[PDB]
Amino acid sequence: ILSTASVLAFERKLDPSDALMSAGAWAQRDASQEWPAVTVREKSVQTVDVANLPSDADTLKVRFTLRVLGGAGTPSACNDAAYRDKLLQTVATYVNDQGFAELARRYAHNLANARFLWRNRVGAEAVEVRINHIRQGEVARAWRFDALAIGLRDFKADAELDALAELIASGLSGSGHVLLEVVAFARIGDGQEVFPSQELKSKTLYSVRDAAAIHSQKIGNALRTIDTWYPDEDGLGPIAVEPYGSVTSQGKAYRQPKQKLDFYTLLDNWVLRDEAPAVEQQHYVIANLIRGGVFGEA
Amino acid sequence: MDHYLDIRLRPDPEFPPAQLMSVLFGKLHQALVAQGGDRIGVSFPDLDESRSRLGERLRIHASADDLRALLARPWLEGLRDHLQFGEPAVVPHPTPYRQVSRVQAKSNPERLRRRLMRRHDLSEEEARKRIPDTVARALDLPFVTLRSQSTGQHFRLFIRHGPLQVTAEEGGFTCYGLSKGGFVPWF
């Protein structure tokens, strides 16, 4: 029969740390070690929470660590062992078809452009991303990208980029452990208001310990924005890899289930009836398996 | 004033287009502060008056050299992903002209009360009896929201397009692209 398992929990791959922010000056980012972090402040307008840079700063210092785990096709809790074996065979067949080539390149793009800087990148005239490869506590290999050249819409190539792509692909395959400290540097302006992820004093801004921060799941949703294989209209760029391709800004869901392009129909075509989809659709399927989920029937 | 440039906000899965309009308006305000001049117009081509919606495009009316200096200004960095634009082409000839105005409001009675402390030195109860709480103005016009480097408070800038006349009038433009007496073509 080979039905879908009743429980199909998948862990998140590419675990993001809780991204802080901090303030400082451009051309002092080489000495960006003891930079003072911005703080959530209550201001009476009714009182609301605001976060902004001080007077003697124009650059943000969003820092988070990303861990590439591997074993993307392996579920954490699968009800059926035959379905788990068939799905592992299908994911391994995908790996022999391509060894996490395009997915790691697009994830290296979402690292390379500061899409994790959601609203801290729109008003910035100079955005910079620094990625250190921490291995046994030391910087194995450093990278210093530029989000101005690497656009948020097109999907290009660059040599250090491909180096980051092979590193993320080796992490996703399982041939090693990849831990990347990513520090952003956006010239948002002198004392301009920044946008941390907001907690729910009508509205509060989330922090960790005397220092404002961005949520991990915001960084994860920014990293998942590789999906361009949806039936795109009206000139929309990449969307986040979600089940049934939904975006909150447009209020609509691409990859509609009335079409045969949502993630679950592509899974049941790929691993149950052996109807292998296109290369782009299986790229999207493996990206959704990388992000994790609670997949399964009821 | 003869040339126009249409900047259309490319849709974003992260932001509704109102914040893109606000960011573009602040960036063009900074560009107009840095450049100087008052022959630079601002319009809204798909301005629907049904729900006071701004639309999804923006129109800039200026000369050839002024628009060339505007594109040569580095204000456009960081906005190429969210916006797309053509070239500073000329406007069509049979185009009726309308004006654009910034209509502010006295939405805070307490601000005017604090003003009247600084002009007549009256008491708080004299301010409350002279100015009640019903003096707040509700304005049903399209608007963008902005913050300033000089004044850190977040302010709303209402934009209103005037009646469609038949000719243009010689007038200047503000740093926001709004008219202090100027006119822009409509097409």
Given a contact cutoff of 8 angstroms between Cβ atoms, the answer to whether A282 and A263 are in contact is no
Which residue on chain B is closest to A191 by alpha carbon? B149
Q: Which residue has the tokens 């605001």?
A: A50
Residues of B in contact with A189 (CB under 8 A): 149
Coil/strand/helix, residue B105: coil
- Let me know whether A250 and A283 are in one domain: yes
Domain assignment present for B159: yes
- Domain encompassing residue B37: 3-104+137-185
- Say how far apart CA B86 and CA A65 lie, in whole Å: 40
- Say how far apart CA A155 and CA A119 lie, in whole Å: 21
Domain assignment present for B127: no
CB contact under 8 A, B78 and A151: no
Which residues is chain B interrupted after (C–N above 2.5 Å)? none
Domain assignment present for B110: no
Provide the number of structural domains found in chain A.
2
Strand order in the sheet with A8-10: A77-78, A8-10, A293-295
Domain assignment present for B169: yes
Given a contact cutoff of 8 angstroms between Cβ atoms, the answer to whether B127 and B115 are in contact is no
Selected for mutation to probe chain B from A122, A246, A249 (highest B CB count within 10 Å) is A122
Residues of B in contact with A234 (CB under 8 A): 11
Show which of A198, A225, A252 is a domain's final residue.
A225
- Let me know whether A29 and A90 are in one domain: no
CB contact under 8 A, A148 and B152: no
Q: How far is A222 from chain B (nearest CA, A)?
A: 9
- Say how far apart CA A92 and CA A110 lie, in whole Å: 25
Buried b (16+ CB within 10 A) or exposed e, B41-72: bbbbeebeeeeeebbbbbbbbbeeebbeebee
CB neighbours (10 Å) of residue B16? Answer: 13
- Let me know whether A35 and A167 are in one domain: yes
- Say how far apart CA B25 and CA B133 lie, in whole Å: 32
Q: Which two tokens stand for residue A139?
A: 């910087």
- Say how far apart CA A104 and CA B46 lie, in whole Å: 41
For A:66-125, CB contacts with B below 8 A are 118-119, 121-125
Show which of A177, A195, A225 is a domain's final residue.
A225
What Rg do the C-alpha atoms of chain B give, in angstroms? 19
Which residue among A118, A124, A192 sits closest to B14, beta carbon to beta carbon? A118
Show which of A164, A191, A225 is a domain's final residue.
A225
End-to-end CA distance of chain B: 14
- Let me know whether A206 and A238 are in one domain: no
Provide the number of structural domains found in chain B.
1
Q: Which residue has the tokens 């879908």?
A: A4
- Let me know whether A127 and A263 are in one domain: no
Please classify residue A22 by burial: count the beta carbons closer than 10 Å to its beta carbon, then call 0-12 exposed, 13-18 middle and 19+ buried.
buried
- Let me know whether A115 and A155 are in one domain: yes
Read off the CATH number of the domain in which B172 is found.
3.30.70.2540
Q: Which two tokens stand for residue A141?
A: 């290999």
Chain B within 8 Å of A249 (Cβ-Cβ)?
yes
CB contact under 8 A, A239 and B13: yes
Which residue among A123, A127, A249 sits closest to B14, beta carbon to beta carbon? A249
Domain assignment present for B33: yes
Cα dist from A217 to A267, A282, B12, B88, B132, whole Å:
24, 24, 19, 42, 47
- Let me know whether A122 and A26 are in one domain: yes
- Let me know whether A185 and A151 are in one domain: yes
Which residue on chain A is closest to B80 by alpha carbon? A151
- Let me know whether A215 and A254 are in one domain: no
For B:50-109, CB contacts with A below 8 A are 74-75, 77-82, 84
- Let me know whether A104 and A169 are in one domain: yes
- Say how far apart CA A47 and CA A67 lie, in whole Å: 38
Cα dist from B63 to A10, A288, B29, B87, B88, whole Å:
59, 51, 17, 12, 9
Cα dist from A70 to A15, A76, B12, B116, whole Å:
11, 13, 31, 67
- Say how far apart CA B86 and CA B63 lie, in whole Å: 16
Amino acid residing at A236: L
Q: Where are the alpha helices (DSSP H) in A113-215?
A: 159-173
Give the single-character DSSP code of B130.
H
Selected for mutation to probe chain A from B7, B14, B150 (highest A CB count within 10 Å) is B14
- Domain encompassing residue A137: 12-71+100-225
- Let me know whether A92 and A190 are in one domain: no
- Let me know whether A120 and A204 are in one domain: yes
Which residue on chain B is closest to A187 by alpha carbon? B78
Residues of A in contact with B81 (CB under 8 A): 151-153, 237
Pairing of strands A225-227, A59-60: unpaired
Confirm whether B29 is a catalytic residue: yes
